[PDB]
């Protein structure tokens, strides 16, 4: 059972009614266009109509590196390198000028954000434009690709080694001395994981949404 991220409400003081109203419109678009299941790390091809030109479409293939947004404003960003020039485009799922979304390769990665690929070697971001879809098996669990990438020289876009990011998909041993690793651990904040008032349990909310979505079907 895969419940898409946007359906889960964020916590706050907003009324539940505003969420019910938004959900109705989201479901209606899904009947017209089907939104496939995917996770950060999977490769996608998205087709959209080009506004500047007249009745001419566009296609972009890349790996999904982030999923954000709630409700009708949900987004996802996918990355690729063309002629040795890196490009990223941020897409909204419910934008009406998206013709089709195709999951070329469905897979999961160790982390739920891959923004550190900007600092990794170019090979880990390049994907063949014309690669054909790979088979999928219904009676299975989604695969977890456990690749650990290699990084370029130390000056980076962010300090990925620091404990807040919680990166588990970088080969730090190759790039950093053990002395530097202890230097980073001075920012740990160990107590955060053990305080019970910072945790948001959404199991019941997830369950209730499931039947209503299925019931509407």
């Amino acid at each position: 059972r895969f419940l898409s991220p946007e359906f889960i409400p964020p916590r706050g003081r907003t009324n539940p009614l505003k969420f019910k109203i938004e959900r109705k419109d989201m479901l209606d678009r899904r009947k017209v266009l089907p939104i496939p299941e995917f996770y950060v790390g999977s490769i996608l091809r998205v087709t959209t109509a080009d506004p500047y030109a007249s009745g001419k479409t566009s296609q972009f293939l890349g790996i999904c590196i982030k999923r954000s947004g709630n409700g009708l404003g949900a987004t996802f960003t996918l990355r690729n390198t063309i002629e040795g020039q890196g490009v990223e485009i941020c897409f909204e799922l419910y934008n009406p000028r998206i013709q089709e979304i195709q999951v070329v390769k469905l897979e999961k990665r160790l982390d739920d954000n891959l923004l550190y690929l900007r600092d990794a070697l170019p090979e880990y971001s390049t994907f063949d434009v014309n690669m054909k879809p790979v088979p999928q098996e219904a009676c299975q669990e989604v695969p977890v690709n456990k690749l650990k990438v290699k990084m370029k020289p130390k000056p980076w876009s962010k300090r990925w080694e620091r404990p807040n990011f919680n990166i588990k998909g970088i080969r730090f041993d190759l790039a950093l001395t053990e002395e530097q690793m202890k230097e980073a651990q001075k920012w740990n904040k160990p107590w955060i994981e053990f305080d019970m008032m910072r945790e948001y349990d959404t199991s019941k909310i997830e369950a209730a949404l499931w039947e209503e979505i299925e019931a509407s079907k």
Binding site: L17, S54, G73, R97, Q99
Partner: protein, 308 residues
């Protein structure tokens, strides 16, 4: 002691009566709300036709939140949601009493509890036979557009395509400094500055030997009435009484706002097309669609937009 003591409704209520009184009050609200559902069959005041220069009453709504929206050209617009909730007409002043050239009508909304209110307000509402409302405001209405007190109002009073005006109290930020409050530049961080980073410079010239009234200084910011002009209406939901308005509205979520049609010069006499006195569903000449849209709006469940 032969002296004053203070009380509250729950002080003397026993265990059984505590729940009973809660239930009794809730039923009283429902009976009084249903009775007012039929204005047209309750001796309505005469309904005059529209004439140039006419002004119409407005509503009180609650701010739900925001969401995106798209037009048939693919342009994306952020929109805010306003819900009408138990809006009634309360009191009428004739032109001479109000002291304005025009007459006035008072509107209330958002039913509230009766327990922690002054007696004066409760007596006022008992006369009108309605449960109390959180907020009252005043609207300037012409004689032809006057409406009898006690008549419910609904979101369908507005229709898509018309511009509107909204006013509400802004978010309160407390006592604030000159940099945040008035956007003052401040001073450099380094090069020898001594304990002067975010402070104002000179108040004024030395010659006057005083400070001009109205000088900009630190003080409490926010929590003031502000108005936004010329916001289009994109869509209306008849079932839940929801209005969608272009752009931003002042205040936090769950805050009451005042809605009235635009007073800008361009939209001077657009009221003729809209229901002139108000919208009455009691008439039941036709049942409205659940959702009302504007032509440029791209509705969901329509086919994907192709920029042919």
């Amino acid at each position: 002691l032969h002296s004053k003591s203070s009380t509250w409704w729950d002080e003397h209520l026993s265990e059984e009566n505590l729940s009973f009184v809660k239930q009794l009050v809730s039923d009283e609200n429902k009976t009084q709300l249903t009775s007012k559902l039929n204005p047209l069959k309750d001796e309505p005041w005469p309904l005059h036709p529209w004439e140039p220069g006419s002004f119409r009453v407005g509503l009180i709504a609650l701010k739900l939140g925001m969401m995106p929206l798209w037009t048939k050209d693919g342009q994306k617009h952020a929109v805010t949601l306003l819900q009408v909730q138990d809006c009634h007409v309360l009191k009428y002043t004739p032109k001479e009493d109000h002291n304005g050239k025009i007459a006035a009508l008072t509107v209330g909304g958002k039913t509230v509890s009766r327990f922690y209110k002054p007696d004066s307000r409760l007596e006022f509402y008992r006369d009108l036979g309605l449960p109390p409302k959180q907020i009252h405001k005043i609207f300037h209405v012409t004689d032809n557009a006057v409406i009898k007190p006690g008549t419910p109002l609904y979101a369908a009073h507005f229709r898509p395509g018309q511009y509107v005006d909204v006013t509400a109290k802004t978010i309160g930020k407390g006592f604030q400094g000159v940099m945040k409050r008035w956007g003052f530049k401040g001073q450099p961080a380094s090069h020898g500055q001594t304990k002067t980073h975010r402070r104002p410079g000179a108040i004024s010239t030395g010659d006057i030997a005083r400070v001009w009234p109205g000088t900009k200084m630190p003080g409490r910011m926010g929590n003031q009435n502000r108005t936004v002009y010329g916001l289009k209406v994109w869509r209306v939901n008849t079932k839940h009484n929801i209005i969608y308005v272009n752009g931003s509205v002042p205040g936090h979520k769950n805050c009451l706002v005042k809605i009235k049609d635009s007073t800008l010069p361009a939209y001077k006499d657009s009221c003729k097309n809209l229901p002139f006195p108000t919208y009455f569903p009691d008439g039941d000449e036709e049942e409205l669609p659940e959702d009302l849209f504007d032509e440029s709006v791209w509705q969901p469940s329509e086919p994907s937009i192709t920029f042919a």
